[PDB]
Symmetry: C2
Subunit: 252 residues, 2 copies
Amino acid sequence: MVYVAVLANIAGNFPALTAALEKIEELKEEGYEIEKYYILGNIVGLFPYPREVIEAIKNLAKTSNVKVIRGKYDQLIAMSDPHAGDPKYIDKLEIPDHLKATLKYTWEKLGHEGREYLRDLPIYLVDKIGKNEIFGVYGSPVNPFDGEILPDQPTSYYEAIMRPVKEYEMLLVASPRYPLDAMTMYGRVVCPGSIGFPPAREHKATFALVDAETLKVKFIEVEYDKKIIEDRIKLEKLPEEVIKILYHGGKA
Amino acid sequence: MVYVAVLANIAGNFPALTAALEKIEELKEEGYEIEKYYILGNIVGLFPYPREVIEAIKNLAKTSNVKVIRGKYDQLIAMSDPHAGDPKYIDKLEIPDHLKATLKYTWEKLGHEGREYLRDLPIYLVDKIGKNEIFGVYGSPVNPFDGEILPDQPTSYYEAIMRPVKEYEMLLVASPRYPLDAMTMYGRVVCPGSIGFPPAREHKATFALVDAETLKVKFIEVEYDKKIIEDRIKLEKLPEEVIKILYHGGKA
Ligand code: NA
Ligand code: NA
């Protein structure tokens, strides 16, 4: 049958992304036919593989239908003056010291072409899975980049969030960080989980496959190598906090 | 020919809305074919005619194709607990004093049925005006409710704002509060003007008619009676500050 692959929060973690894409190639040998991909942010920003992540997405988009939308971290980079000489503007932003470091590094490594790529990324996902209209945004409908839809809340919580977008059958968001599939009277609120941004310990690249016909959601978890990411963080001189996030999780 | 009427920022000003609608009816008698209406927020919130504004729209929706989206003020009311006994939460919001007064007034005057109506209002407008896809939001694509797009800026300013929504031919926003029609390489950024929220002195109910085939924008200005609004403000014991905004304009 046919499913739509939904991924989110790669956050510059190339190994996690590669593991996920390879699992998908394998599932296609298992009866899954994947007509298109939805990739929610953050795309880059935390882990040291910004260029490899974008290249992998660009390559996928050439042979498959890929719709990508930017996340908070992507926007913090894209919003900078196009010909800024450095990422110093970041030191004034109200964000943790560790994020300031990774964002600066990302800004630099991306170069002008990488930064322009982020600037071309849409903010909103408006498409249909099957014959069903769906809407997608990084944070929440009320606030695209700073809004946070929490996982583990009662149906009433999700019902109120879905109301403003009740014309859509499904709302796709990245902020919950964990697999979420909440049916409400106004439609379903869904989070595919997190690809490369660990929410806690023993993180596994997580994403979702949604049935284009029935809209049912299946969540997939795939292991990836954290040691090579740890080594890269060290080699690149990034904050120890980034390693702590890798193994114990952290919030956006 | 055929046009789509675009209105924004009624802000509870029934007399202004009535004047605009009546002008539309006159233009129809003059050969203007109106296919549908787009009514961007703020619907209610500042002036004392919340119930009458909603009733006028509802009746319009009965006979014509009308799509409405909420604005900042509408959201501040809709976000409240469905069974709160008063609008006291508003006093703790970081908004000017006069707005607390008018929002609380609006909250109670709306009644449960009125507030529920705002809660059903979509946040985003996604439609086609002919073969042209369009997107609409109150503030800005980056921040739906708090985002502000300025008028009278260089093309480069609007270009950067259109880029994240470049999949659409036209972006409709209310925040500029003045007629705006800026063409960029990524599409046009348009503001129909303000229907009932004066940005300055001698304000006239302003809206736009968009050519359903050429996407050409025509702005219309209509006069309405401010004295009856002033009198209503006084009768309802609302801030003198609202009368000030009425004749000298005020900011959202
Ligand atoms: Na729905
Ligand atoms: Na465009």
